[PDB]
Amino acid sequence: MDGLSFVDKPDGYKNEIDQLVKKEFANIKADNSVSTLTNALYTEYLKQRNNKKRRTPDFNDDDDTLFLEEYRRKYPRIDTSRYIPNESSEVSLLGIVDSYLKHQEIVLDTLLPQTVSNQWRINNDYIRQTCTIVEEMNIQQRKQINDLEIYRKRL
């Protein structure tokens, strides 16, 4: 459990440790039918075919075709109507969303600081604990090698 990351400063011993972990692992061995087609169209990954009067490019083919042509007119009048109320302001409704995107963006870069200051406030505390244990383990190892050589000289 206790393994110090700061004070212990090789990639081969990681590869030496990875084999012995593996040698023990070589041993241990809500919607409707809308959910059905949205899965099925994505799995097949094929776009659904679309039919347009303009694409057909057929004029006066018969009687049904004549009805289709009308559809072109009231869409172009409505498009010119939607191009009229877009061209009325045409810069001022677009600029008020650009400032809206600026105030939304700074909040995430505000949240980028509050994590980054707090995550280093975690690592600043553990490193002090990392250096304290290495100090106590050193005096333990210093007293350990002394006793191993004292008892040999005592005998």
């Binding site: 039918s33 809308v34 087609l37 169209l41 559809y71």
Partner: protein, 36 residues
């Protein structure tokens, strides 16, 4: 400021071209009443 029953259509790519036929016909039933 002042009976609703939800429309249960049928038992979804069919409903995409279903909506396309309505907005086509909605413009055609609007356009006939303007020339008339």
């Amino acid at each position: 400021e002042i009976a609703q029953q939800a429309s249960l259509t049928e038992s979804i790519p069919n409903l995409l071209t279903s909506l396309q036929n309505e907005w086509d016909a909605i413009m055609l039933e609007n356009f006939k009443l303007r020339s008339t």
